[PDB]
Amino acid sequence: GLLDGKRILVSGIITDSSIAFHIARVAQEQGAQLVLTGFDRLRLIQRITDRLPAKAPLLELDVQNEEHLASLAGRVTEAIGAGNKLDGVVHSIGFMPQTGMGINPFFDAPYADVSKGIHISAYSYASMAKALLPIMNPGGSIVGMDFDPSRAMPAYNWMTVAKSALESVNRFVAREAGKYGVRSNLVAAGPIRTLAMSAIVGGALGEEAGAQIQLLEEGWDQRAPIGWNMKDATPVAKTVCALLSDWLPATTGDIIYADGGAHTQLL
Template identity: 55%
Template sequence: MTGLLAGKRLLITGVLTEASIAFHTAKHAQEQGADVVLTGFGRLSLVQRVANRLPRPAPVVELDVQDATHLDTLAARVRDHTDRLDGVLHAIGFAPPSCLGAPFLDSPREDVSVAIEVSAFSFKSLVVAVKPLLGPGAAIVGLNFDGQAAWPAYNWMGVAKAALECVNRYLARDLGRDGIRVNLVTAGPLRTVAASAIPGFTGLEEGWTARAPLGWNAADPGPVARTVCAVLSDWLPATTGSLIAADGGVLALAPV
């Protein structure tokens, strides 16, 4: 089989619906020659139905990144489907409602802790869990939204994304000696399940579309998914610890 990812074996987390970046990444990766294993949390029957809509049905492994048993056994359960991983997509994020849209100063410590653990610390947790399956040349990619600015309503999820960006740099530092690359793809706003939890998302989407030099279609995860596939490939062998934007060019512009 030929393609950008021919022969690659990938673990892709965060597939919930066909609108997700993770689903489109799995789809494009298969079209480029990769074999994929998916992870799901909670509604596994739904994830499996979505997995069956890929060009080639993919196996689904349960993963709750807050469950130590799930993490400790992940490598063994992935080995039921493949003996190695060449790439991993971390597409996991969550913040309780008090951390999105509600007054920033009112968010309780417990809810902020959940947002940081699931959206940032889990990047490290996932890497540690699958490291026995990774070898030189492997690539780890996380999904990001700009953590450098204070966006309306994004609140503590913005803090979590800033933490994720920092985790990315430290993972790149520590895994480089093993020949493993770690990068984030920073996406523009897309109409995913996660986006539906952000108050005022429509306004963010409209403003983004108006400003993007290349234009922006919030209904199309394809450009972001293809960027992820490129970073998972062998074509960026000297790139690690980076934030790679797939956002139509908005983040390159001066703020208004």
């Protein structure tokens, strides 16, 4: 197994279409022993994660809750056993209020909403690294989920800005993590039909936003030299596992694109 004997924390599962659900499944297939973290709806998340190949302890983590973060390392150590540390951490957490994601004009998102989205989607990558680096082994790996924000796109709006901030945060987390012998990287995924994504395409944020997001997805498969299947998160999950493994040992502060190559082509 690619991750045999590694202890890895995976955040971000909320449904069986969450990217983190597939990260967790593949990591377990590859021999990793997991600790899961979930936000708010913990009975739902437990029921969802009962479908994973192996049972995993589930800890509550609201990344906006300073007490959750202050206690997190102790609760993880309780879950994996004293004297054991983590080898990997997966941040698969993102949120932007509807006002920031195309339900209204870009200029009409109040800063209170934007700042909540940046807190959850970008600052919390540093928050989780601060909490967990003290219980991570040398040679460990922190991975977060990205959506390439180097160019503006319709509808994604302030979530794009949040991903721009996240990419910058990752480069600073790498500086801190390196003192522990730990790498920090993001995986920039192509679009994936999660429940939230499918709802947007179905018009949950208005018809214009849904039409714009559907056009975004279609251009992706067209541009990608190997194609892109938005209904299949497994290639993204495998890429996360590659970064969690020992096989990218000189990559840190960086971004790996699991997008079919779409960002390398113009059309």
